[PDB]
Design a protein around this ligand. Structure first.
Ligand SMILES: [Mg+2]
Ligand SMILES: [Mg+2]
Ligand SMILES: [Mg+2]
Ligand SMILES: [Mg+2]
Ligand SMILES: [Mg+2]
Ligand SMILES: [Mg+2]
Ligand SMILES: [Mg+2]
Ligand SMILES: [Mg+2]
Ligand SMILES: [Mg+2]
Ligand SMILES: [Mg+2]
Ligand SMILES: [Mg+2]
Ligand SMILES: [Mg+2]
Ligand SMILES: [Mg+2]
Ligand SMILES: [Mg+2]
Ligand SMILES: [Mg+2]
Ligand SMILES: [Mg+2]
Ligand SMILES: [Mg+2]
Ligand SMILES: [Mg+2]
Ligand SMILES: [Mg+2]
Ligand SMILES: [Mg+2]
Ligand SMILES: [Mg+2]
Ligand SMILES: [Mg+2]
Ligand SMILES: [Mg+2]
Ligand SMILES: [Mg+2]
Ligand SMILES: [Mg+2]
Ligand SMILES: [Mg+2]
Ligand SMILES: [Mg+2]
Ligand SMILES: [Mg+2]
Ligand SMILES: [Mg+2]
Ligand SMILES: [Mg+2]
Ligand SMILES: [Mg+2]
Ligand SMILES: [Mg+2]
Ligand SMILES: [Mg+2]
Ligand SMILES: [Mg+2]
Ligand SMILES: [Mg+2]
Ligand SMILES: [Mg+2]
Ligand SMILES: [Mg+2]
Ligand SMILES: [Mg+2]
Ligand SMILES: [Mg+2]
Ligand SMILES: [Mg+2]
Ligand SMILES: [Mg+2]
Ligand SMILES: [Mg+2]
Ligand SMILES: [Mg+2]
Ligand SMILES: [Mg+2]
Ligand SMILES: [Mg+2]
Ligand SMILES: [Mg+2]
Ligand SMILES: [Mg+2]
Ligand SMILES: [Mg+2]
Ligand SMILES: [Mg+2]
Ligand SMILES: [Mg+2]
Ligand SMILES: [Mg+2]
Ligand SMILES: [Mg+2]
Ligand SMILES: [Mg+2]
Ligand SMILES: [Mg+2]
Ligand SMILES: [Mg+2]
Ligand SMILES: [Mg+2]
Ligand SMILES: [Mg+2]
Ligand SMILES: [Mg+2]
Ligand SMILES: [Mg+2]
Ligand SMILES: [Mg+2]
Ligand SMILES: [Mg+2]
Ligand SMILES: [Mg+2]
Ligand SMILES: [Mg+2]
Ligand SMILES: [Mg+2]
Ligand SMILES: [Mg+2]
Ligand SMILES: [Mg+2]
Ligand SMILES: [Mg+2]
Ligand SMILES: [Mg+2]
Ligand SMILES: [Mg+2]
Ligand SMILES: [Mg+2]
Ligand SMILES: [Mg+2]
Ligand SMILES: [Mg+2]
Ligand SMILES: [Mg+2]
Ligand SMILES: [Mg+2]
Ligand SMILES: [Mg+2]
Ligand SMILES: [Mg+2]
Lengths: 275, 100, 114, 88, 68
RNA sequence: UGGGAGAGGGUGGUGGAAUUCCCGGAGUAGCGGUGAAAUGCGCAGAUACCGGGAGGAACGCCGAUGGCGAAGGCAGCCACCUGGUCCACCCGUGACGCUGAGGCGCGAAAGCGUGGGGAGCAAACCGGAUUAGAUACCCGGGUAGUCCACGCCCUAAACGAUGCGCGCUAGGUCUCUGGGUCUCCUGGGGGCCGAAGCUAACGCGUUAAGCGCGCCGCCUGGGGAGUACGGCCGCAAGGCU
């Protein structure tokens, strides 16, 4: 669910927060955290390369297992569910039977203390990892490697999940959260179920600073700039766009495809995103 | 508990080892989900009125049992999982109804 | 060239199609109302199917066809008479079957079927 | 559902006397079992209103009865409900 | 030519009695009514459900082509 | 206590036919549509055929003058959870009952909010036709909406234009489901014609609109008007009075 407040300040009348209820432990696993180096958009030159960032609350990065084939056939117990301000999903605190601990993100439906395992012969049940040539066609999955051994790349945000459509040769076919149909590889692990916190998107920040706590600054309109700054800028009084709506760098921003043409991944992409 | 009639249809092409192995899964999965067998009636391959799994034949089983009423559903959900399991119909066993 | 084959009669209120296929089902030749030179409701006539069915058969055998199993779909007033000339054409008409499609209460139809 | 057995145990544990059936005290306890199992039932299937009707008529009965018992044997009115925790 | 006479004892619930059950489905695979099956009300109803279940198991057809 | 039938309601799985689009093979000059035509689609390869895949919705025959439900309403199969109801045996309590202003809950379709979903169909809309005109009836497209979840909304030819319970008053034929002794008898529902009786007539008639008792709602010419005012409810459209 999601929690609302009363209009007891003008910004609460709308604001909404998660309920966390799936939360179990309120303290990260020291040995799994490490410093997250904030950037402010700027790069190895001090120049902003990602407009309008900086000033968000300080965070402490939870190292995550996007491999999980790192330990084949070593079951574990979901010790606790934690919260990672470094992503929209929830992390699962896994105590393997080796003794080693490490973090994953919470598939929807996990329960503290239940057991999970990775491996080809692993059971298809919300919380386990397998390749793709071994998962039942039609099962909703996530945390999908895009290629063998390169780590989970797909379906990693809240409610995100990819469903298996069919099989072809050494590859398999998935439906991405973007409606796209792509050939993935069978030897690329996944994790049954869908990601958690699916109530995320229904969130109303309610006021301006709450976007600052998130490190995302104010975003100005090209209409409010000047011609030296933005293509849309200037013009006495207000004004329409006077041209194909463009980015501050010149190029258009209303239906101009930029996915590189001669890109090999095409051969493995089928249905471009929908809607 | 309750007594039903586990009605299962499996891939007709598998080999004997490919065959009963699924059954073992069935037998175990049966057992795991508090299933107690009674009768049984394995009728082999057979002609179908229409292709299942785009395969005209289909090798049937049939188990009368008695399991906990509150555990039947998770079963079939366990049995339909097999890429070789293709039909699975549970039916509350009921007194026959005769004619003439 | 093929001797035995098939024949499908799509019989509809507004017209009638006659397409002849290879045993596998790959069409080999086809024909319907307008092909013989009719435009409009006149197409929705049996005699059309005759020429239609006929003109399709005539062209068919020209490729070697001599036998074909029959398949009819639809409820057209030009249906049966089409089945006629086909028999009275020059082909052995090895069989007749009505595979007319019918849902089981699926999609809704247009306003004019209610 | 409720088991014939489960039904008996109650019956016996409220029968006025050995071969007691169809008496106020028991007549309330049965409903009380059916009720408490509808409510505990409805706490999930929030949409099945249909069933939710008799649930009212059930309590309607029990409420009709109890007051009869209320009218006749007071001490007996309390003790009972107290044994079932029924007054809200 | 009603059918119930054509047979004797037989389980309306033997949802696997194809050779029997398939006897009540016109050569077009459809279920046959009561002016044609001789079955009664409660009877008739107890059938189909029997047939249907099989028609789901893969035994009986949902429909069949027609031959003239 | 023992049983029986059933689209009663809710959750989760699930089965096949058809429409639409995508991909592949084959194939040619028109398909589609109408009262007739046209817009439209088609040599950039459509229509009709075969094969594979994806997605949504509604469940053909059974099926019906049928069934269940207080109502709206409910229809593929399966299981689970649950309601009401009927029959028998005549076992227990021993008038514990009927009605019900208020209150509360349910409430088809459309409509509203949030988040999904979106094949077919389809208000507004565009187009093509008929017309003196055609902001319509027919045709080609097509957006919301129709589908799911949670919230509202609470109206209707929500009809049997017939409030609910009980008792009394010929029967005949049909049908559903029970019980018997199985010819037939008895309970409970669903239709039909009709005893007396009622009724302004048409009509009803053991499912009364008949003779009665109890309780609630309601009418008091037509229109103005289910409008105005106030009050309540509601996000709004609008509802109640
Ligand atoms: Mg608050
Ligand atoms: Mg609040
Ligand atoms: Mg304020
Ligand atoms: Mg405010
Ligand atoms: Mg708020
Ligand atoms: Mg909260
Ligand atoms: Mg939480
Ligand atoms: Mg929660
Ligand atoms: Mg701390
Ligand atoms: Mg450290
Ligand atoms: Mg770091
Ligand atoms: Mg960094
Ligand atoms: Mg540096
Ligand atoms: Mg430097
Ligand atoms: Mg420098
Ligand atoms: Mg800088
Ligand atoms: Mg940027
Ligand atoms: Mg920045
Ligand atoms: Mg932050
Ligand atoms: Mg959140
Ligand atoms: Mg937001
Ligand atoms: Mg922003
Ligand atoms: Mg701005
Ligand atoms: Mg300016
Ligand atoms: Mg400058
Ligand atoms: Mg410029
Ligand atoms: Mg400008
Ligand atoms: Mg100006
Ligand atoms: Mg201008
Ligand atoms: Mg301009
Ligand atoms: Mg790649
Ligand atoms: Mg399967
Ligand atoms: Mg049986
Ligand atoms: Mg035509
Ligand atoms: Mg009751
Ligand atoms: Mg009371
Ligand atoms: Mg469309
Ligand atoms: Mg093609
Ligand atoms: Mg096709
Ligand atoms: Mg019908
Ligand atoms: Mg009816
Ligand atoms: Mg007695
Ligand atoms: Mg006494
Ligand atoms: Mg009442
Ligand atoms: Mg409503
Ligand atoms: Mg609706
Ligand atoms: Mg809206
Ligand atoms: Mg709005
Ligand atoms: Mg929407
Ligand atoms: Mg659309
Ligand atoms: Mg239209
Ligand atoms: Mg004009
Ligand atoms: Mg005009
Ligand atoms: Mg118009
Ligand atoms: Mg249309
Ligand atoms: Mg809207
Ligand atoms: Mg609107
Ligand atoms: Mg709507
Ligand atoms: Mg809506
Ligand atoms: Mg009302
Ligand atoms: Mg009516
Ligand atoms: Mg009525
Ligand atoms: Mg009225
Ligand atoms: Mg009266
Ligand atoms: Mg009988
Ligand atoms: Mg009667
Ligand atoms: Mg009459
Ligand atoms: Mg008279
Ligand atoms: Mg009078
Ligand atoms: Mg009645
Ligand atoms: Mg009343
Ligand atoms: Mg007046
Ligand atoms: Mg007046
Ligand atoms: Mg009104
Ligand atoms: Mg007002
Ligand atoms: Mg009003």
């Amino acid at each position: 669910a999601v929690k609302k407040f009363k209009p007891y300040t003008p910004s609460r009348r709308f604001m909404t927060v998660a309920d966390f209820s799936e939360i179990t432990k309120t303290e990260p696993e020291k040995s799994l955290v490490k410093p997250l180096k904030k950037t402010g958009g700027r790069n190895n030159q001090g120049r902003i390369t990602v407009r309008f960032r900086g000033g968000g609350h300080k965070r402490l990065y939870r190292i995550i297992d996007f491999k999980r084939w790192d330990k084949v056939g070593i079951p574990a117990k979901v010790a606790a569910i934690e919260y990672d301000p470094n992503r929209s999903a929830r992390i699962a605190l896994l105590h393997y039977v080796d003794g080693e601990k490490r973090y994953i993100i919470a598939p929807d439906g996990l329960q503290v203390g239940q057991q999970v395992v990775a491996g080809p012969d692993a059971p298809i049940q919300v919380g386990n990892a397998l390749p793709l040539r071994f998962i039942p066609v039609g099962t909703v999955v996530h945390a999908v490697e895009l290629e063998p051994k390169k780590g989970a790349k797909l379906a990693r945000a809240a409610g995100t999940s990819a469903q298996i459509q069919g099989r072809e040769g050494d590859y398999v076919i998935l439906r991405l959260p973007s409606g796209e149909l792509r050939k993935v590889h069978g030897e690329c692990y996944a994790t049954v179920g869908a990601v958690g916190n699916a109530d995320h998107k229904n969130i109303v920040l309610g006021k301006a600073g709450r976007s600052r706590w998130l490190g995302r600054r104010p975003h100005v309109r090209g209409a409010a700039m000047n011609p030296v700054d933005h293509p849309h800028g200037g013009g006495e009084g207000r004004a329409p766009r006077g041209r194909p709506p463009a980015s501050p760098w010149g190029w258009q921003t209303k239906g101009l495809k930029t996915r590189k043409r001669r890109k090999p991944s095409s051969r493995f992409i089928i249905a471009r995103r929908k809607k | 508990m309750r007594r039903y009639e586990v009605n299962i249809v499996l891939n007709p092409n598998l080999d004997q080892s490919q065959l009963a192995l699924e059954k073992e899964i069935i037998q175990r999965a049966l057992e795991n989900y508090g299933a107690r067998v009674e009768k049984v009636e394995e009728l082999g391959l057979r002609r179908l009125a229409y292709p299942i799994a785009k395969d005209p034949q289909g090798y049937f089983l049939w188990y009368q049992v008695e399991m906990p009423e509150d555990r039947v559903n998770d079963l079939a959900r366990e049995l339909r999982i097999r890429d070789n399991v293709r039909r699975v119909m549970v039916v509350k066993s009921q007194e026959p109804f005769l004619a003439n | 060239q093929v001797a035995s084959g098939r024949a499908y009669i799509h019989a509809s209120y507004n017209n009638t199609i006659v397409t002849i296929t290879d045993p596998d089902g790959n069409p080999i030749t086809w024909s319907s109302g307008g092909v013989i030179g009719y435009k409009g409701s006149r197409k929705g006539t049996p005699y059309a199917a005759q020429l239609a069915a006929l003109d399709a058969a005539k062209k068919a055998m020209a490729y070697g066809m001599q036998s074909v199993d029959v398949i009819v779909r639809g409820t057209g007033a030009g249906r049966e008479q089409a089945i006629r000339a086909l028999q009275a054409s020059g082909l052995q008409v090895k069989s007749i079957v009505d595979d007319t499609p019918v849902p089981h209460n699926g999609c809704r139809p247009k306003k004019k079927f209610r | 559902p409720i088991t014939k057995e489960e039904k008996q145990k109650v019956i016996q544990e409220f029968a006025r006397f050995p071969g007691d059936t169809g008496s106020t005290e028991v007549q309330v306890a049965l409903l009380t079992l059916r009720i408490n199992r509808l409510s505990e039932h409805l706490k999930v299937h929030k949409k099945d209103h249909h069933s939710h009707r008799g649930l009212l008529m059930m309590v309607g009965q029990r409420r009709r009865l109890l007051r009869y018992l209320q009218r006749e044997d007071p001490e007996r009115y309390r003790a009972l409900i107290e044994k079932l925790g029924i007054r809200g | 030519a009603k059918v119930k006479a054509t047979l004797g004892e037989f389980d309306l619930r033997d949802y696997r009695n194809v050779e029997v059950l398939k006897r009540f489905l016109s050569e077009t695979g459809k279920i046959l009514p009561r002016r044609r099956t001789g079955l009664s009300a409660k009877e008739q109803r107890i059938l189909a459900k029997t047939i249907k279940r099989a028609r789901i198991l893969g035994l009986l057809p949902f429909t069949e082509k027609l031959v003239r």
